[PDB]
Amino acid sequence: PNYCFAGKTSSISDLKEVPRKNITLIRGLGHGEVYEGQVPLQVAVKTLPEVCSEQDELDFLMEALIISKFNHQNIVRCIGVSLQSLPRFILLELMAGGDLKSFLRETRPRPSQPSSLAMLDLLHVARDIACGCQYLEENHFIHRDIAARNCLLTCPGPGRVAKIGDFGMARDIYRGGCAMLPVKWMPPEAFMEGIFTSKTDTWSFGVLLWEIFSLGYMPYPSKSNQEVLEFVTSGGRMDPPKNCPGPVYRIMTQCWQHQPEDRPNFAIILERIEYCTQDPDVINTALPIE
Ligand SMILES: C[C@@H](Oc1cc(-c2cccc3c2CNC3=O)cnc1N)c1cc(F)ccc1-n1nccn1
Structure with missing residues (x-):
């Protein structure tokens, strides 16, 4: 093989x-x-x-x-x-920080640690994964499962670097059931026609951005896979995560454009993440304290 x-x-x-x-x-x-x-x-x-x-x-x-x-x-x-x-x-x-999904849930600001995480930590994780996605896009490789569960962190601390750590879905397609497909991370042309392009990863990146800024919540709160499929196909989109700055939510809504041609490539996504990182109104926004 x-x-x-x-x-x-x-x-x-x-x-x-x-x-x-x-x-x-x-x-x-x-x-x-x-x-x-x-x-x-x-x-x-x-x-x-x-x-x-x-x-x-x-x-x-x-x-x-x-x-x-x-x-x-x-x-x-x-x-x-x-x-x-x-x-x-x-x-x-060995990524000593573990998976991103677990990190976001365990490192959520709390009364004991109010500044455990800030908007800049989240923006740095988003930039790191978008850089990995950009590398895949420029090498014509479609990940097909960009999600927090598939990302790893080099360390729990501020100098952490996020990386894509799992390629199981891509391996399966290179060479199985509908209940195992990551429906909540897929654009309409992917679950409807089985059409995959670099714009499939852009849509999933939008969902990962929501996972990051929600601090590890499951996408589409309270919705099952079929409810999400019908909701997204009908034009339905997730609300901003709690305290999410407008410029960050705007990146998500651009990733979720119905037509793949209307979604940004990863160079434009990185440019927009960079602008959010520079904006004091974005990075000075406090994350919710659970
Ligand atoms: C295949 C696995 O890879 C790694 C995993 C970890 C890791 C993960 C969790 C905790 C801790 C650590 C390290 N110490 C912890 O406490 C570090 N580095 C890796 N390379 C993987 C890749 C992925 F993308 C997603 C998940 C997993 N995963 N998590 C468990 C089993 N599978």
Whole structure:
């Protein structure tokens, strides 16, 4: 099974095989299973269950090829693989800040920590992911699942850098059911016609922006997948998250334009995030205290 990215072909032989003896698992991180490990290089170890089908094996190899071929500061690095021993491993850059979805919920301003997060922290996370999305767009790669659950943070503190850390949906499409599709992150032409372009990621980026500025709420509060599908197809859009500055909400509503041609590309999105970052009326807005 070969892989093509940016018109360059790669195969399992191009993956960096790390000797199994050099790898130590330290603790579980979540669910196959994921561990924090060591090679010393700190890594996140993605495992392939030994009890798997041949399709699961090919999917695992395809995931390794996809991540290893990217080269961008906002896309998780692949340290290598351990495919010559069972269970097979994919070794990723250990993102000590964990997933973005959990970070937003755990780091929400509270009476004990009123300034735990500010608008600038959120704008920096949005810029970081938009930079990763821009890299994918300029290399003609469609992510198909831009969402907070798929983003990682280098550290919990102010110097944190956000990165795209999962490419499962893209791997599946490269090569399954409607109840597993990320309906709440998809534009109308994607769930209706199965039409995917770089403008599909623009729409999903708008939804991720809402997730960031809501501090980790599930999109379309109280709506099921089919309710969202009918709502979005009929022109319905989410309200601004609590205390969301107008200029930031305006980026979201532009990402959610019905026609893909009316949605901005990632260069324009980055330009608009930069302007929000400069505006004192935006960054001086206090986040809600839960
Ligand atoms: C495959 C996995 O990758 C990583 C995960 C983490 C991580 C994640 C959560 C907590 C903590 C850490 C680290 N320490 C924590 O406390 C760090 N770095 C990674 N490379 C991943 C990639 C993604 F995009 C989304 C989710 C997951 N995930 N979360 C669990 C299982 N799977």
